[PDB]
Curated annotation (Swiss-Prot), chain A:
<keyword id="KW-0997">Cell inner membrane</keyword>
<comment type="function">
    <text>Produces ATP from ADP in the presence of a proton gradient across the membrane. The gamma chain is believed to be important in regulating ATPase activity and the flow of protons through the CF(0) complex.</text>
</comment>
<keyword id="KW-0066">ATP synthesis</keyword>
<keyword id="KW-0406">Ion transport</keyword>
<comment type="subunit">
    <text>F-type ATPases have 2 components, CF(1) - the catalytic core - and CF(0) - the membrane proton channel. CF(1) has five subunits: alpha(3), beta(3), gamma(1), delta(1), epsilon(1). CF(0) has three main subunits: a, b and c.</text>
</comment>
<dbReference type="GO" id="GO:0005524">
    <property type="term" value="F:ATP binding"/>
</dbReference>
<dbReference type="GO" id="GO:0042777">
    <property type="term" value="P:proton motive force-driven plasma membrane ATP synthesis"/>
</dbReference>
<comment type="similarity">
    <text>Belongs to the ATPase gamma chain family.</text>
</comment>
<dbReference type="GO" id="GO:0046933">
    <property type="term" value="F:proton-transporting ATP synthase activity, rotational mechanism"/>
</dbReference>
From Swiss-Prot, chain B:
<comment type="subunit">
    <text>F-type ATPases have 2 components, CF(1) - the catalytic core - and CF(0) - the membrane proton channel. CF(1) has five subunits: alpha(3), beta(3), gamma(1), delta(1), epsilon(1). CF(0) has three main subunits: a(1), b(2) and c(9-12). The alpha and beta chains form an alternating ring which encloses part of the gamma chain. CF(1) is attached to CF(0) by a central stalk formed by the gamma and epsilon chains, while a peripheral stalk is formed by the delta and b chains.</text>
</comment>
<comment type="function">
    <text>Produces ATP from ADP in the presence of a proton gradient across the membrane. The alpha chain is a regulatory subunit.</text>
</comment>
<protein>
    <recommendedName>
        <fullName>ATP synthase subunit alpha</fullName>
    </recommendedName>
</protein>
<comment type="similarity">
    <text>Belongs to the ATPase alpha/beta chains family.</text>
</comment>
Length: 240, 128, 116, 82, 116, 116
C-alpha cells in the first residue's frame, strides 16, 4: 500500500542484516577460541587415559565400587545444553535423542533421575517433569571446575550409596567446523575396551605403592569423572 | 589541509564500514578495537557550535593532533572539550606561527616541528 | 454459512478451519527471516495442520481427466465433515502430508498413506 | 640425568630438561636427578616446588597438591589447582 | 530553544533528553526481532531511562477532568527542570515506571511510589 | 562471447577464466571469516591463479607516457589467448605474481620475472 512503510521495512531489514553479520563474525572468533582452548586441554585427558590404563594393568586384581556392575536399576543421565537460542536447533536434537532413550528405559521399567546443566533444559525440559538433583545454570562461556564441581559430585555420592547404578552423558560430537552430531556415552562403570596397551612393551615391574597400596585410586577416579564431564561441556560449547 | 585531510577521511571510512561491532568490543582483537576507538574520537571531533567559524590554522592544528596519538589519551566524551582548550592555548602563545600559516598556507619541516613542539608543551603543562 | 441454516457442527468446523488457516498465514515472516526452529511447539502444530488442510482441499475432477489421466472422484458432504473433524481433533498427526494430495475421501487418504 | 619433568594441573603444560635438582615437600627431595629406578607414585603435598635446571637457573612454581608419578625416564605430575 | 535565550542548564537538559530518546528509538528493531537479553548493560539502562522519561511527560488536565475523573495540575518550570535533571543524573533507577504516570510533579512521584 | 562467432577455444578459455574468478570471489569471504588455513590444495591453487589473472589484466597505456614514462602497449589477441591458456594449464605456476603487474604481453612477463 503506502510506499513509506515499505521503505521503512526495507531499512529495518537492512539493519537486521548488518547486525546478524556482526553476530556471525563474533561467533567465528568465539569458535576459534573454544577450538584452541579444547585443543590445549586434550593432551591432559590423553595423559590421564594413559595413566588409568597404566594403573588398571598394574593392579587388575583389586576393583573399586565404580568398577562394579550391579544389575541395571535407577539409571541416570547428564544433559548439557545452551544458555540461549539462535543455535540452529541442536539442543532439540539432543533432547529428542534423550527422550527416545528414556522412553526405551521406561519400556524397560526403570525410573530415571538426572542432572541438568544447560539453561534450556531447566527452563523448558523441566516444564513437563522429571526428578533433578542438580540444576546448575548460567555457567557461562569457558567456565571453571569450581563452577561445575558439586553438580556431578552429589550424583556420584548418591551412586555410591547404591541408589544409582548407570550414569549417562549426552552432548554434540565435534566432527567438522560445519557439521556436528549428538552423542550418547556411558562412563560410570569405566568399562575397559582397549586393554592391550603397554602389555607388549616392558612395564613388567609396575609400582611398589609406598604411600598406599590401592587406596589413592578413588581420587584419580573422581578426577577422571570431572575431566570427562568438563570436556563434554566444552565440546558442546564449541558445537553451539 | 590537502596533506592532512586524507588520514581523517580514511578513519571515517573505516569507522563507517564497521559500526555494528560497538557492542561486542571486547570480542575483537587489538587492531579493530583501536580502529573503533579512533573512529569514535574522529567522529566526535567534527562537532562544532554556531557562529564560530574556524580559521585554517585551527583546523590544521586540530587535524594534526588527531592524526597522531595525542588524541588517544583523552576520554571520548571529553573530545569536544580540550579542543577549544588546545586552540585557546595557541593564538596567545604562538601568534606568529598562526599568522604565518593563515597568511601563506605553506607546509614544510619547520612548521611541522613547531606544531609538534606546541602540542607537546600543551599536553605537558596545561589542563583542560 | 449460518448456524440456523447449515447446523451447529458445520459452522463450528468451518470456523475452526478458517481460524487455523488465518493463524498460519501470519507466521510467513518469522519463518522467512529466521528458521523453523525459532517457534513454539503450538505454532509448529498450526503450520503442519495448515499444510495438511491445504493439501486436503484438492481433489481430481471428471472433466480434467484428459489433462492428467486419473479418474474423477465425488465426495458426499458428511464424509468431508467427518474428515475435517478428525483432522482438527488431533488424530492424523502421523500421516505424512504427501498422502493428502488429490484423494477425495479420507479412507482413501488412509489407504494411500501406506504407499507414499 | 634428567630428560623430562611434566606437571599438568588443569590445562597448563610445563617445559623441563636436564634438571639438576628439585625440591618438594612430602617427597624427601629425591626428585631432581632421575634415579632411573624404583618407580613410585605419591600424593603430592600443597607446598611450592623449586626447580633448578642448570648453572643456577632458579625459578619457582606453586602447586596445590595432587598425585605425583615418578618412573625411570618418565616423570609426570597430576596436581590440582585448588 | 537557544543557549542565549533560555540559559545554559535548560539547553543541556533538553538536548540530553532528546539524545536519550533518539538513541532509544534505534533499538526497536533489534529487540522486536531478536531477544532483549542479547544487549549491553548501557543499552538496558538507556531503554529503562527512556521509558521513564516517555511516561513522565504525561500530566492530567483541568478541562479533561470529565474524561478520567482526576483533578488537574499545573507544574511550574523550575519543578520540571529539577525533576528531569535528577532523573537524567542517574538516580530514580529503583522507582517503578508506574509512578511516572499522570502524576504532575516529582515529589508527587515520590509520594506515589509508596503505593504503586 | 559464444562458440559459433569467435571459435571454440576462445570461448572455452574465457569461460574457464570467469569460472576461476567466480570461485575466488566465493572463497574470499571464507578466507576472511576463518583464515587462509583449514583449506586443501586445489583452493589454494585457485587463489594463486586468480591473483595472477587479476594482476595480468592490467597494462600500461599510450596516453600515460607523458606522466610516467613507461611506453604504451598494443597486445594482440593471439598473445593474450596463448598467455591465458598457458596460465590456466599451469605452466606459469612458479613465476612470482609481481612479474605479472602492468607488463603487457607474455614474453615481457618472462623477461620481467627473469630480471627479478
Amino acid at each position: 500500500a503506502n510506499l513509506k512503510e515499505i521503505r521503512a521495512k526495507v531499512a529495518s531489514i537492512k539493519s537486521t542484516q548488518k547486525i546478524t553479520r556482526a553476530m556471525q563474525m563474533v561467533a567465528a572468533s568465539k569458535m576459534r577460541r573454544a577450538q584452541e582452548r579444547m585443543a590445549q586441554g586434550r593432551p591432559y585427558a590423553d595423559n590421564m587415559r594413559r595413566v588409568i590404563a597404566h594403573l588398571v594393568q598394574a593392579n587388575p586384581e583389586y576393583k573399586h565400587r565404580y568398577m562394579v556392575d550391579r544389575p541395571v536399576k535407577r539409571v541416570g543421565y547428564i544433559i548439557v545444553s545452551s544458555d540461549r537460542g539462535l543455535a540452529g536447533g541442536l539442543n532439540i536434537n539432543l533432547f529428542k535423542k534423550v527422550v527416545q532413550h528414556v522412553k526405551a528405559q521406561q519400556e524397560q521399567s526403570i525410573e530415571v533421575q538426572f542432572a541438568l546443566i544447560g539453561q534450556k533444559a531447566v527452563s523448558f525440559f523441566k516444564n513437563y517433569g522429571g526428578k533433578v538433583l542438580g540444576a546448575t545454570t548460567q555457567i557461562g562461556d569457558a567456565p571453571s571446575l569450581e563452577q561445575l564441581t558439586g553438580s556431578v559430585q552429589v550424583m556420584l555420592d548418591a551412586f555410591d550409596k547404591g541408589e544409582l547404578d548407570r550414569i549417562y552423558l549426552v552432548s554434540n560430537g565435534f566432527v567438522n567446523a560445519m557439521t556436528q552430531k549428538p552423542k550418547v556415552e556411558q562412563l560410570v562403570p569405566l568399562a575397559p575396551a582397549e586393554e592391550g596397551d603397554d602389555l607388549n612393551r616392558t612395564y613388567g615391574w609396575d609400582y611398589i605403592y609406598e604411600p598406599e597400596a590401592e587406596e589413592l585410586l578413588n581420587g584419580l577416579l573422581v578426577r577422571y569423572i570431572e575431566s570427562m564431564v568438563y570436556q563434554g561441556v566444552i565440546e558442546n560449547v564449541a558445537c553451539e | 589541509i590537502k596533506k592532512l585531510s586524507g588520514g581523517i577521511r580514511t578513519a571515517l571510512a573505516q569507522y563507517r564500514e564497521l559500526a555494528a561491532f560497538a557492542q561486542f568490543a571486547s570480542d575483537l582483537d587489538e587492531a579493530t578495537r583501536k580502529q573503533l576507538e579512533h573512529g569514535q574520537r574522529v567522529t566526535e571531533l567534527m562537532k562544532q557550535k554556531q557562529y564560530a567559524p574556524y580559521s585554517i590554522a585551527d583546523q590544521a592544528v586540530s587535524v594534526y593532533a588527531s592524526n597522531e596519538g595525542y588524541m588517544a589519551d583523552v576520554e571520548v566524551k571529553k573530545i569536544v572539550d580540550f579542543d577549544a582548550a588546545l586552540i585557546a592555548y595557541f593564538r596567545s602563545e604562538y601568534a606568529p606561527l598562526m599568522k604565518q600559516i593563515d597568511e601563506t598556507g605553506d607546509y614544510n619541516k619547520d612548521i611541522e616541528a613547531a606544531i609538534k613542539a606546541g602540542i607537546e608543551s600543551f599536553k605537558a603543562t596545561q589542563t583542560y | 454459512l449460518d448456524p440456523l441454516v447449515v447446523g451447529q457442527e458445520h459452522y463450528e468446523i468451518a470456523r475452526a478451519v478458517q481460524n487455523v488457516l488465518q493463524r498460519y498465514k501470519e507466521l510467513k515472516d518469522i519463518i522467512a527471516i529466521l528458521g523453523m526452529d525459532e517457534l513454539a511447539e503450538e505454532d509448529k502444530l498450526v503450520v503442519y495442520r495448515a499444510r495438511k488442510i491445504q493439501r486436503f482441499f484438492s481433489q481430481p475432477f471428471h472433466v480434467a481427466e484428459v489433462f492428467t489421466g486419473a479418474p474423477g472422484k465425488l465426495v458426499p458432504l458428511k464424509e468431508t465433515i467427518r474428515g475435517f473433524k478428525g483432522l482438527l481433533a488431533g488424530e492424523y498427526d502421523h500421516i505424512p502430508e504427501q498422502a493428502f494430495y488429490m484423494v477425495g475421501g479420507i479412507d482413501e487418504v488412509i489407504a494411500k498413506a501406506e504407499k507414499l | 640425568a634428567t630428560m623430562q619433568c611434566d606437571v599438568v594441573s588443569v590445562k597448563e603444560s610445563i617445559y623441563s630438561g636436564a634438571v639438576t635438582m628439585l625440591i618438594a615437600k612430602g617427597a624427601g627431595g629425591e626428585l631432581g636427578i632421575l634415579p632411573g629406578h624404583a618407580p613410585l607414585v605419591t600424593l603430592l603435598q600443597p607446598g611450592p616446588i623449586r626447580v633448578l635446571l642448570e648453572n643456577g637457573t632458579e625459578e619457582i612454581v606453586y602447586v596445590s597438591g595432587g598425585v605425583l608419578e615418578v618412573q625411570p625416564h618418565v616423570v609426570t605430575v597430576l596436581a590440582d589447582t585448588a
